[PDB]
Design a protein around this ligand. Structure first.
Ligand SMILES: [Cl-]
Ligand SMILES: [Cl-]
Lengths: 124, 124
């Protein structure tokens, strides 16, 4: 079984690009990170910063999670992110995504020792 | 019982200001929109655009909702928004919120006739 920290890395980290460079970014990344294996994951955000910068958010601003838990943290700075969301034309196994690049604060849930991101809650 | 459309208006519309003007915006708005009545709503976004502009999103870009439903729409343009999230010092009945102003696309779920926003899904 994949650890929670490792799943977060796979689903939400893309440190190898500064930003989405085209409309096809999401189609490509959703496939390669294995998020379209048996069904199309409807919504998923990738963060274009170093793993260290994202892990650091776990010691930044403590805020409520949307679900009411108290282990969420909001980045002090904005980060480059890409939101991927299925389009109307999307139908497994032919998943199709809209790519939206933005620079926003991120909010992650953190857990464990070391205390690291395990869920992506939202961007602001 | 409040209708779904009316609840969306109460929870998510603030057309009377162009933007949050101070750190106390959320404390004030969460109280006055009756979102701290019996418990502190952990997270809530207000949109600083006309009701008509927000309703119009229901005929803009169709995208997946985070929960996998297909009735979500992403605004073509960015909108002024304020995210309100409970802080660590927050404890009912003394709710306390962090105010974060941003200009982002909004994503809403739409339902009914007329086809209007009934949930705020996310911002991008
Ligand atoms: Cl996500
Ligand atoms: Cl919200």
């Amino acid at each position: 079984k994949e650890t929670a920290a490792a799943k977060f890395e796979r689903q939400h980290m893309d440190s190898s690009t500064s930003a989405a460079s085209s409309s096809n970014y999401c189609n490509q990344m959703m496939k390669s990170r294995n998020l379209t294996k048996d069904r199309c994951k409807p919504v998923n955000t990738f963060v274009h910063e170093s793993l260290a910068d994202v892990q650091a958010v776990c010691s930044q601003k403590n805020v409520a999670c949307k679900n009411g838990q108290t282990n969420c943290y909001q980045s002090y700075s904005t980060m480059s992110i890409t939101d991927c969301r299925e389009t109307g034309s999307s139908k497994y196994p032919n998943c199709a995504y809209k790519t939206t690049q933005a620079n926003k604060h991120i909010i992650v849930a953190c857990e464990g020792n070391p205390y690291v991101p395990v869920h992506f809650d939202a961007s602001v």
